[PDB]
């Protein structure tokens, strides 16, 4: 199988809270090279913030969570780790996981998805979702995702069938504190009637998952 | 502790374009020193991915219109022939030591035909009205260059500070953008107006468009 690294653990967490993120490894051996965790706080650059030489268990630190922050890595399980610590508004940020290709490779050559760290006091809570129905050749359609924390949503079309023309636009941040956004897809008008569109939200910091059907 | 220092900051270019980004190191390092800086692109939402490593080596997989070079405290990433899959934002990085560290980035936006946005207004729905709040939403699909300014008129009151706009990443396939603007207003103030209009201004308009609706059709 081919090399891949997975990360999981992310979601909200309260300031001074802990929190344990996890990447798994696949298609090599952690054994033959460094680990690392990489951040990205929103909208800002890539911050490198822990290595870890999985063998013999060497690590070391961005200064920036030097002391919080604890790298760690389990061979048998090819997996590495992330224990944070005392954690501030400042460590919101995507983590990936990645590594150095090897003996002689530097460089950062696969890195996971990235799992979304949210720090703050504000609690957990799931979207409402509304239809954006259509009327009068082309149509347009959507859902409304509507007040709902912390981030993020996935939102797709007729259970992954329809992606073509689909725009699922950033959420913006309400006055109140929680998260909105729309997902629009332009359709042909003769469809109507004839297919049904759905859009599969789902918000798993709620466990959160909620079909709706979109009509006039 | 060497720090990249990357440049330009944003750049906008079109499809075709020969396009050179730059990254400079605080470390003096000398002119027979080369080979210890790796380039990144990252697409909004995504890991980034490796493009170049030790300067000038193209990663396996990535096409042939990357090319970078460098020596001394000097590198530059070039794009031959810029393609509309090329929008995001690019990163080098020092390996010749660490900690590892990156440049600030680089974006990298698609330049192309203007297109005037498709408008598209949507009513509050009625499973929505019984919360006790309303939202009516304007679309404006597909079109470029970014700039455009939506305004919403109630019953002709001009609306303001009640709205709230998001617009989409540049698309990877047409490098056009994509808007939406949400009015949010009480039941009580929803009901007692009538007609909804959203007036959106592009420089692909020679006129401004108007998508409206009375409540209750």
């Known amino acids: 199988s081919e090399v891949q690294l997975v990360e999981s653990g992310g979601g909200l967490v309260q300031p001074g809270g802990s929190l344990r993120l996890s990447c798994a490894a696949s298609?090599?051996?952690?054994?033959?090279?460094?680990i690392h965790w990489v951040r990205q706080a929103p909208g800002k650059g890539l911050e490198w913030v822990a290595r870890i030489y999985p063998t013999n268990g060497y690590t070391r630190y961005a200064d920036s969570v030097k002391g919080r922050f604890t790298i760690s890595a389990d061979t048998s399980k090819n997996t590495a780790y992330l224990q944070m610590n005392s954690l501030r508004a400042e460590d919101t940020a995507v983590y990936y996981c990645?590594?150095?290709?090897?003996?002689?490779?530097?460089?950062?050559?696969?890195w996971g998805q990235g799992t979304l760290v949210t720090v703050s006091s504000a609690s957990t809570k799931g979207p409402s979702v509304f239809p954006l129905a259509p009327s009068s050749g082309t149509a347009a359609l959507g859902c409304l995702v509507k007040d709902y924390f912390p981030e993020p949503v996935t939102v797709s079309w007729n259970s992954g069938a329809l992606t073509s023309g689909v725009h699922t636009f950033p959420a913006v941040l309400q006055s109140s504190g929680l998260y909105s956004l729309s997902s629009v897809v332009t359709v042909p008008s003769s469809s109507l009637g004839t297919q049904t569109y759905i859009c599969n939200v789902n918000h798993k910091p709620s466990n959160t998952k909620v079909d709706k059907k979109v009509e006039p | 502790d060497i720090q990249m220092t990357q440049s330009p900051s944003s750049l906008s270019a079109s499809v075709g374009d020969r396009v050179t980004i730059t990254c400079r190191a605080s470390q003096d390092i000398p002119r027979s020193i080369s080979g210890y800086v790796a380039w990144y692109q990252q697409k909004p939402g995504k890991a980034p991915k490796l493009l170049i490593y030790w300067g000038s080596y193209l990663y396996s997989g990535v096409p042939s219109r990357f090319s970078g070079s460098g020596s001394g405290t000097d590198f530059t990433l070039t794009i031959s022939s810029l393609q509309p899959e090329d929008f995001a934002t690019y990163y080098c990085?020092?390996?010749?030591?660490?900690?590892?560290?990156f440049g600030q980035g680089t974006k990298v936006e698609i330049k192309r035909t203007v297109a005037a946005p498709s408008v598209f207004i949507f009513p509050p729905s009625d499973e929505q009205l019984k919360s006790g709040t309303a939202s009516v939403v304007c679309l404006l699909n597909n079109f470029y260059p970014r700039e455009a300014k939506v305004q919403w008129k109630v019953d002709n009151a001009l609306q303001s500070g009640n709205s709230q706009e998001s617009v989409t990443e540049q698309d990877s396939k047409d490098s056009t953008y994509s808007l939406s603007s949400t009015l949010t207003l009480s039941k009580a103030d929803y009901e007692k107006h009538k007609v909804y209009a959203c007036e959106v201004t592009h420089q692909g308009l020679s006129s401004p468009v108007t998508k409206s609706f009375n409540r209750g059709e």
């Open positions: 298609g090599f051996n952690i054994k033959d090279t460094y």
């Open positions: 990085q020092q390996h010749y030591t660490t900690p590892p560290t």
């Open positions: 990645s590594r150095w290709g090897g003996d002689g490779f530097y460089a950062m050559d696969y």
